[PDB]
């Protein structure tokens, strides 16, 4: 307990001072035991302290939840990864999505869908439909990875359509309950708002995420360190869940291609373990520009001596999740500042190394 807190303090405290992080929550799953380390302030203005129940925006860590709902649709044979995208939304039939697979959308290889929807696209069903209807690939589907909200957002929306209900309803009514997540929200209840940390940007501008097209699919989850560790433990032990949910989690542990040291799954990104900190930082700090992929001859099991991870950022928050299946080791780092991905990995690496 002294060694473990000293290890986590040594990793966290300098990174919080260097990046002026007001509050940070750590959760570690070690050999099936949870450990929580809470630092600093959820809100500077009233001095509310971070706890393991504080809600943080996890940004693009939401994509691993989106991938899990798609895994659930696969498990129920409502869809297949080699389906043409437009088979799941009649509004897209006759568009370029006639020639793009669900796997291409899930893995950012549809042919140049951008990082974000253009500002001209509001959170509006018609605007989003018309955006996709008019879109044309810049390059061949299946050839270049460009990290993209509209890409995996559409994957998530099409998975929900395949299940016959809206995305946000499936998450609240089926997925969060199935995984035992009662402190995980797309739309934070009025009664839980007291737990919602403040985000801090430039000059400590207060920042909580506003509405955007396919926000729920791309970046919309708010959760606690305790709940996000529950999600990690479900990923470490899919076999403990009812069969369809065990399968949905397994679908997110399959690699399709490599870019540098990274193997791309559905939501999760994987590295061999051990690997240098510099390489794990570089993987998580990629130039937001297109990368040629190396396609695997068959989908690869993402298990054993590998680190699976995901970064997530909003204007006010910075999240990182990592787990090593072969070591039954999981960690969550949630902060209320969008501090650099390399600094998030720096904390995590110090902890995971400390425990190897
Ligand atoms: B997501 O968090 O992944 C991501 C990272 C990362 O992996 O850490 C870094 C940089 C960008 C992204 C994209 C994802 N996050 C967002 O899209 C943030 C979101 C974008 C829309 C904003 N509101 C628009 C204003 N009308 C809010 C922040």
Numbering used by the authors: 5 to 360
Task: Give the article text.
β-Lactams are the most widely prescribed class of antibiotics in the United States, and antipseudomonal cephalosporins (including cefepime) are important therapies (alone or combined with β-lactamase inhibitors) for P. aeruginosa infections. Taniborbactam (formerly VNRX-5133) is a novel, investigational, bicyclic boronate β-lactamase inhibitor shown to inhibit members of all four Ambler classes of β-lactamase enzymes. PDC-88 was chosen as a representative member of the group for detailed characterization and is noted for a T289-P290 deletion (by structural alignment-based numbering of class C β-lactamases, “SANC”) in the R2-loop (ΔT289-P290).
The active sites of the PDC-3 and PDC-88 structures in complex with taniborbactam revealed strong electron density for the bicyclic boronic acid inhibitor. Taniborbactam was covalently bonded to the hydroxyl group of the PDC catalytic serine (S64 by SANC) and made extensive interactions in both the PDC-3 and PDC-88 active sites. The boron ring oxygen hydrogen bonded with the side chain of Y150. The cyclohexane ring of taniborbactam made van der Waals interactions with Y221. For PDC-88, in addition to the Y150 change as observed for PDC-3, residue Q120 moved toward the active site to make a hydrogen bond with the amide moiety of taniborbactam.
